[PDB]
Every structure is written in structure tokens, then in C-alpha cells.
Amino acid sequence: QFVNKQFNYKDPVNGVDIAYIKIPNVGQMQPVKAFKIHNKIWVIPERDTFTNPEEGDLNPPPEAKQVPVSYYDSTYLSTDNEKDNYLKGVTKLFERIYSTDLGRMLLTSIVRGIPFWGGSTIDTELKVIDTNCINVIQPDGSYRSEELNLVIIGPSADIIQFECKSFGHEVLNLTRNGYGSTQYIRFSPDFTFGFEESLEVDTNPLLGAGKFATDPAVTLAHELIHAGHRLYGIAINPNRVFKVNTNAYYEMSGLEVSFEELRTFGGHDAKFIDSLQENEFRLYYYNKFKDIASTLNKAKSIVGTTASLQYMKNVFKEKYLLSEDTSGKFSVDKLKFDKLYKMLTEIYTEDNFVKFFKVLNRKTYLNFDKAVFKINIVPKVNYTIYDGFNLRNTNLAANFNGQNTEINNMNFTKLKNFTGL
Ligand SMILES: [Cu+2]
Ligand SMILES: [Cu+2]
């Protein structure tokens, strides 16, 4: 039971876990009703029109960066019923991820991954970064600042463009300096991609109509792995890209793929990161954990009355698994660092979650999305916490027939094809 309350979107606000909140970094926004489904994790059942200036409207008319795959529907997720299903759909996916040993570990790491209190211009003091807070409206009408790790919110203009975003700092690269920052994941449980089971077909841009559907639990789990990296500040700079030499169509298109994506998928795709540069990243981020201990040791007092210095030093020693000594100074044990680092980068992978979900999934990040379907995972006759679409004791249990969009017709409505374009 990862979510204690079965939230209904129309549930009255209480100012604790059902409240209207504001995103401080946005700067200008009307309060939005949010739901805290777990310690440090909120769900905003709304379209994301706040987290960036250049996307205030849900209209397909931008010249920023087009993509072969896209779908738009400015009215999606606007009615209260759809927001209720969005909140119920995201909840069921969290529980599905939580019912697996791999997902339970990931979510534990996400809750522990508290963004670092490294925003003090006086190294003798520990102070929060305002990037990692939300403003909750209390019953008296006033605002209350609240730290959180992860925020799940509806997609922006392009409905199927699922990203993980975080607000930046003046100088610090929070997602790549070990500090970490509050992550916002644009996600929707009401859509899912289609893919081909054959590798020759799934990696060819002119073949396949998307026979099989992607289990949205893997999709969310994929995005959680990104947040896991960025909550611990070990995300690889997106400029570090890998040019695919093993695909004739990728090669003829010059399309790159970031190391962060190849790492997040894991399995056979992570090989494309040579051993040389893997130790390059491992050592680099390990040194960033030194500064955190160096900063953590110079801290003699704490700013604010939220928590005591000793409690914040303990939470950061639990997060980064610091090696605590009789003197009280914190250090980084390389043996313990490599375990946490390997846990976040090599254990939490899309490939590994496919093994625990017992589902069919595309075999490589270097494929061509075939189609996008419309789904509804809320009803138990459609989707379950423990089986997804492959419902047990039905004709959908074997051969991933639940994911077979041709055999499980009532659960998938093709909205748009991607092959040929
Ligand atoms: Cu991301
Ligand atoms: Cu990714």
C-alpha cells in the first residue's frame, strides 16, 4: 500500500494532503488543487502550463522543435471527471510499480533522495534551495512552504511528450552536482505507445502499425528512473550524446541519443557507453559527493525553524550513505558510493522493470514509435495492479495477449499512426 488514501478529485481540500498549491519558481499562476499520495510526492491532475514560459497554451503552433511523433488535444484533462481518472490512474500505476521488489526499491530511493540544502552563501550554515519547495494554502488562507521530492503532473501541449523537468539555479547544476532538485514529471496514464515485437520491424521507420501496446507502468517507471538520477544529482549532461552506428535509418538521419537515455533503458543499450567514460562519470560524480560531505562538515548551524541541524545531517547521510565516524565528520566510502551509484544507474532500468512486470516491451531505445493508443487503466476489467493488461485466468494472460492491441480490442483506440512519416 504505497498510497494510503483513495483520493477523489472532488474531495474537499484540507490544507495537508488535499490543498491548492503554487509552484514558487513559476512566478505567476492561479492556485492548483494538488494531492499528496505519499511523503514528498504530490500529484497535480492538470495540464502543465506553468513550469516553463514558452508553453502557456496547449495549442499546436510552435516552431521551437518539431518531432516526427506528436499528438495534440487542447481539451484533454480539462473536465473534473477526467482529472478524477487521471488521479486514479496515476495511483494505480504507483501501486503496480510498488508491488515489485525493483519498484519498491526505486520509490524508497526517491523518497530518500531529498534535494540538498546547499543554497547558503555562508558555508557555516545549512539552508534550503527555494527550487525544492511548493507553497500550500492553509485553512486560514495563508501560504505554507513545503519541501517535496517528486511531482507528477499532466502533459503540456504535446500530450505524448513525457519528460521529467526541474527548475534551475543561478550557478549550481543541481541535477549534475550531487545536490538534486525537486523533479516534475509530465505524464499521462490515459495514453500509451504501440510497438512491434520483431526487432527488424520495430527499428525500421517504414514497417509496423504498432501491434503491441506499451504498459504505462513501465513508462512511468522509466520517468521515475530519470527523477532518481536527478534527485541524486548524478544525471549525465544531455550534451553527452551517442551517435548510433548500428542503425541504418538512425545513421542516415544523424539522430543522436543522450547517454542519460541509454543509461535509463539499461540492458543492451547501456553497452554503448564505453568502460572508459563510465569510470569517467563514476569518479566525477563521486567527487561531487565529497563536496557535499565537505559542505556538510563545515555546517555548524541551520537556517530556518523547520528542522534541526542534526536531523538534516542525518537525512543527507542516509541519502548519500555517508560514512560517519566517531569525530562526527562525514566522509565518502568509495565502496559504499559505487553500490548506491550502481543501484541508481544500472539496477533501476527500463529493461529490469520489464523482467519484474512480466510484460512485453520494446527491446531497444533506438526504435521508431509506431502508433499511440487511447487507454483506460482505472477499471479492473481493463487493468490490474498485479497483471496490467495481461489479466489472469482470461484469454489475455498468455502470450501478452492483454498487450496485443489486435486481441484486446476494447482496451485500445488508435488515435494516430507514425509509420511512413
Ligand atoms: Cu527528465
Ligand atoms: Cu528517457
From Swiss-Prot:
Has slow autocatalytic activity, cleaves 250-Tyr-Tyr-251, 266-Phe-Gly-267, 419-Phe-Thr-420, 423-Phe-Glu-424, 430-Cys-Val-431, 432-Arg-Gly-433, 438-Lys-Thr-439, and probably 429-Leu-Cys-430 over a period of 4 weeks. Catalysis of the '197-Gln-|-Arg-198' bond in SNAP25 is estimated to be 10(5) more efficient than autocatalysis, leaving the physiological importance of autocatalysis in doubt. Ubiquitinated by host HECD2. Deubiquitination by host VCPIP1 prevents degradation by the proteasome. It is found in: Secreted; Host cytoplasm, Host cytosol. Zn(2+) binds at H222, H226, E261. The record marks R362, Y365 as: Transition state stabilizer. It comes from the Bacteria. Has proteolytic activity. After translocation into the eukaryotic host cytosol LC hydrolyzes the '197-Gln-|-Arg-198' bond in SNAP25, blocking neurotransmitter release. Recognizes the '146-Met--Gly-155' region of SNAP25, which confers substrate specificity. Hydrolyzes the '202-Thr-|-Arg-203' bond of mouse SNAP23, but not in human which has a different sequence. Reduction of the interchain disulfide bond occurs in the host cytosol and probably prevents retrotranslocation into the synaptic vesicle. This is Botulinum neurotoxin A light chain. It comes from Clostridium botulinum. The lineage of its organism: Bacteria, Bacillati, Bacillota, Clostridia, Eubacteriales. The chain holds residues 2 to 422 of 1296 of the full protein.
